Design a protein around this ligand. Sequence first.
Ligand SMILES: *[C@H](O)[C@H](C[C@@H]1CCNC1=O)NC(=O)[C@H](CC(C)(C)C)NC(=O)c1cc2c(OC)cccc2[nH]1
Ligand SMILES: *[C@H](O)[C@H](C[C@@H]1CCNC1=O)NC(=O)[C@H](CC(C)(C)C)NC(=O)c1cc2c(OC)cccc2[nH]1
Lengths: 306, 306
Amino acid sequence: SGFRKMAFPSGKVEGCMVQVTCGTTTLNGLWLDDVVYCPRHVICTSEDMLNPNYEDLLIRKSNHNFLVQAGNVQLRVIGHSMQNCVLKLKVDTANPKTPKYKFVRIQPGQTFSVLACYNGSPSGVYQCAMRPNFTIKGSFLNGSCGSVGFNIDYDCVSFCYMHHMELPTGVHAGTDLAGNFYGPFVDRQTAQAAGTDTTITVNVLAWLYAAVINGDRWFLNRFTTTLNDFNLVAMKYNYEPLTQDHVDILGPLSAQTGIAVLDMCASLKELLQNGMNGRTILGSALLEDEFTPFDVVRQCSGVTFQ
Amino acid sequence: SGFRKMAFPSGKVEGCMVQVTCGTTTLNGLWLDDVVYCPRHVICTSEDMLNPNYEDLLIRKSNHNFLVQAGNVQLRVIGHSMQNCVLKLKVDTANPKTPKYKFVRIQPGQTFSVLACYNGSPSGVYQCAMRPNFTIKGSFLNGSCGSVGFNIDYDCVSFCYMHHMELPTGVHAGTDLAGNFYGPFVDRQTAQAAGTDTTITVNVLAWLYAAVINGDRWFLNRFTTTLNDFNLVAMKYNYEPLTQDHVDILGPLSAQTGIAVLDMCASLKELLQNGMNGRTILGSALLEDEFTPFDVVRQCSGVTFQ
Ligand SMILES: *[C@H](O)[C@H](C[C@@H]1CCNC1=O)NC(=O)[C@H](CC(C)(C)C)NC(=O)c1cc2c(OC)cccc2[nH]1
Ligand SMILES: *[C@H](O)[C@H](C[C@@H]1CCNC1=O)NC(=O)[C@H](CC(C)(C)C)NC(=O)c1cc2c(OC)cccc2[nH]1
């Protein structure tokens, strides 16, 4: 038992991390087979960065301008091309550590592990959710761009995120690995705001089920509610609506605990209207929404990866 | 910016994880050079486990009784010996993936990363503190014993924890890698309780400094207090005493933020007497105590590891 914010083992991704230097800019790249993927703003300098034209900037570049640095071994760039907001640097060596992988784009509400990197070297690993407003609440400093987010499914690494920027509120924005931003953000230094967020209702319910699985039961009650009556309460508290598909996804957790989904909703409703009265749930004094139903089943059941 | 509970990249440890099977018991082992380390209770069966005599049980064992399983390659055991509560299985192959390492024992209040494993396969990674009562609030299921906790210092892995058991309150107990338990626990199925815990005061103050570094300032105040006057408040709230050495360790964070340590203590004092009044700090509605001063500097500065 116990419930922790758990990231995937990072080893498969650590073997893909390289350093990319162009001009005065150093950032991280992702080396899969004979390609290194990195944010296109590596080709920029501090005054290019107010409003760049990256197509113009890239035709001005040479292969030899890109210093790719894999640990203490330099990789020769033999070609380059831009795909949306990422660069693809073709190198003369395939990465012998390339895992099975996929480039997948995730949905707000879904979680992933981030391997924070500086100078091509991994710094730490942590779990993040894609917020409903397409930001992520990460931990990123100068030089962390090109760090990636990912899930692992048995032996296959599904890359879903490359880091590009921090918004003024201290949240983070980036692209999928095809270079397409999550949300209405651009890789320019202009006035960009996150947009109003909401709480991921289905995840809160998942975490309440994790709590019950772990012996926290004080918030349970005999009441119930309809899906429509719950959603009127969700609106008032800036929780996102709960759909019948969300109810379906929560079925397994409902069955393991014996608590109907709509009964748990009645418990959430009372937690929203009353607060927690000085008590905690799974060591938190807040309703946590960055655990998916999958994350709960995975942790509370013991799935591994090879 | 941002502040997350961050674990170390786990790759160096993943390459050391193996499966150890003896009789009906399967657990995890740690393969460094030509030795596999695992909990000694692998030699037990369900009725041995009420009150074992492990010396008696071990002399009854043969090398060939130990199936060591490194991925899909079997390791031949050529010797065995017990060191306190761990077994040392001598194998005929040195692990080619052995990192630089050390066996270190940590202090309550100190943090480490846990690579949770089942059947020799890594499941997830997360950050834990050693509580003042020598337990850890982890996430562990049947088969997770032999998972290890660790820190990484540049390229060197300091192993500090091997998992052995769960207490009735849902917290976890284990040994250092020399097989010596943290706290007053034994690897027997008898009535064992954790003992009353306290809050790690110096860590809370570190996390308040992380908050300030990240723009959370609402809890700051113009008041100050003496170390003795603060410690009278700490006692009443079951916070552990703050020493001058703790003040010294918090010096760098004090200097970066311009907030004297004792001024932050005055802020903690008011948070303890008043609560947070519906507000949050770094996304938490509780005072967090599982970040050391080092963890804060590491994250808020960007240290990596090779
Ligand atoms: C790449 O390593 C870096 C990562 C951020 C630095 C600090 N935290 C980060 O996550 N990305 C980066 O510096 C962006 C460069 C591009 C070209 C994408 C704009 N810049 C920003 O994130 C950025 C710039 C600004 C400005 O302008 C000064 C104002 C407010 C926020 C902001 N974010
Ligand atoms: C090893 O994989 C296992 C890990 C725990 C299983 C569930 N969560 C864990 O962290 N360790 C294990 O099963 C212990 C075996 C020894 C030989 C060390 C006792 N057993 C326990 O952790 C254990 C046994 C009990 C009992 O007795 C039934 C009562 C309360 C708590 C408890 N913990």
